[PDB]
Symmetry: D2
């Protein structure tokens, strides 16, 4: 197939007590898998459309593609953005740390802005730290669902899943507690790597 | 300022009779300029939010940023994607040409899918040919407004503005005639350059 | 058919000089007609789906229905909400006038809020004065496209089309001039009638 | 206050085993309450905007109003649409029953279409049976979030909450099992009452 489900870079319960293994198992094995299958199906349908010269369902297929592919991209980044506490730095350093200070003033300011973007979402969505190739800077974006509210060319560096399936079983309606806990498992090494390769447009 | 209004790489009337100079002037001088100002204003507002430590309007600011920056990005690519008839080949060649046949079967198949995506939009939007870094392929996407219905990381190669302001003064409600005439001014050299630079992950 | 295109309650050029007959002709005969045909097609497709027990395109059909039916409802109200200047009152009176003062403070306050909602839209949309059956009050809503950003049960009283096709040929990019001119042709008698029948849930 | 949190017409655990009491408590006491507060706050902010004559945040306030009020409306209908098994007939009768056969062919056909609309949502949303005043018929709509994908004037008759918080704690990712169990607690008497009152234009 074109798209494949990546394996988690750690055990399902490696993020505990911050994120339960039960959520990790359902989130990865069920939800992420659905997006991969959906993105592949969308491409197969578009190929069939071209062969028969029948683009009647083009509007449906383009949304199926955007929704599922965005879901695949977002989750793929999400898994790598995390690591068991202690396995990675608790704060950004070197170039990344300097860039964050440059575009947000300080790490604390970026954290506050990112947290506000995460908890204020009206519906399903993501809080995202991206590299803007046009402005050559790091911005925070608030995705709606998986594929809305973002400029083309945006390169994801750090993402936080704010869909209810990401925290409900453990934190219930208290999304604030989920966000606080999540900061403990952010893999700043992964974010630093993405930044190193992203700041080249 | 972080964002700047790029000058057109040709005269306002250089795309006639396909796209009138009247539309080119209003589209560039008024519409695009508004998105540049809006993107700059959003960043300024976010900076003030951090200094004041008040993120009450975070939802508004994140949408203002995404909408305006996406408008700026989309129009910036749009201008470069076009050139006076006779300036570039009327059909993709070399590496780009081979990639189009690989991912769509033929140039005609690509045109058909792109055209269907452009004319079927329910509301304002864009038909877009992008490079998908994850699947390492060229896909067609149908943007809603400027910032919706697309996966993060999508690299724009060729874009067609389907907002009514882009064609109404000349083609009125007949979207099909607009898209048909537009193919005549596509600068395949610019698209090929973007593909080359995008391909290098 | 289930849905039919209503005829304009006046001649195409009756709203001049405020709204040109050229816009009225295209807007009614072309755009509105498309929504009626689209809504009817959506229903036929859903019927075919039930017969064959094939709901594969349900997501597409439900959006086709919402988009087109909303477009039909919005435009149907829009035509009746207008009348040649002098043929109707220039300001709300009696119950309607009292209700507007009650929920907005004054006619001028309602006009300012409505105007701001109309000119600030990011993309295609409508500025709408609706009756809220749950709160038993009159509110202003900002529709996105035709079918987004509104509570179920909302009863339209006064609507202003902010899609670019509604003003571009005459006012170009200056949506502010369009809104100012539009106030001159509002049929307050039609709005008063809708209010009389709407305030019953 | 303009909006108030309605009390449940039954005990929190009266819908078991179909819908757990744990979900009913969180759903009503936490989620619904938040939408009521949000709708009230939006109105207060709009009132302040008028007094200060500053509508700079109009786009934010109109979305806050639509999102929260729609959430309030949707949940208010949702609670009344359900009742303990045995309280009402398991199948529509009389006027409502005849209307369902007229617009869907049969009760089973309606259930199939409604179920497909409920399980196919890409993101948060609702499956809704509404009375269309323009076409004078009963249609099924698929809401996105709380306030998207619906025509103005739509009168809700029967609604099913498909947001993840509505079923995750009990059914996890298996949306189909949730919808299947939900049909057992549908209060057809409430739906029939809404149809009667909606029908009277
Ligand atoms: Fe997720
Ligand atoms: Fe444009
Ligand atoms: Fe219109
Ligand atoms: Fe809910």
């Amino acid at each position: 197939a074109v798209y494949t489900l990546p394996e988690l870079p750690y055990d399902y319960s490696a993020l505990e007590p911050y994120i339960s293994g039960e959520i990790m198992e359902l989130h990865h094995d069920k939800h992420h898998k659905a997006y991969v299958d959906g993105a592949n199906t969308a491409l197969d349908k578009l190929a069939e459309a071209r062969d028969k010269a029948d683009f009647g369902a083009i509007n449906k297929l383009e949304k199926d593609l955007a929704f599922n592919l965005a879901g695949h991209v977002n989750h793929s980044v999400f898994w790598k953005n995390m690591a068991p506490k202690g396995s990675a730095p608790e704060r950004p350093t070197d170039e990344l740390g300097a860039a964050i200070d440059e575009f947000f003033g300080s790490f604390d300011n970026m954290k506050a802005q990112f947290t506000a973007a995460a908890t204020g979402i009206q519906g399903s969505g993501w809080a995202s730290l991206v590299w803007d190739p046009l402005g050559k800077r790091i911005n925070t974006l608030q995705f709606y669902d998986h594929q809305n509210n973002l400029p083309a060319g945006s390169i994801p560096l750090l993402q936080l899943d704010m869909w209810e399936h990401a925290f409900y079983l453990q934190y219930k309606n208290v999304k604030g507690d989920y966000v606080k806990s999540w900061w403990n498992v952010v893999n700043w090494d992964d974010v630093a790597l993405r930044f190193s390769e992203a700041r080249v447009a």
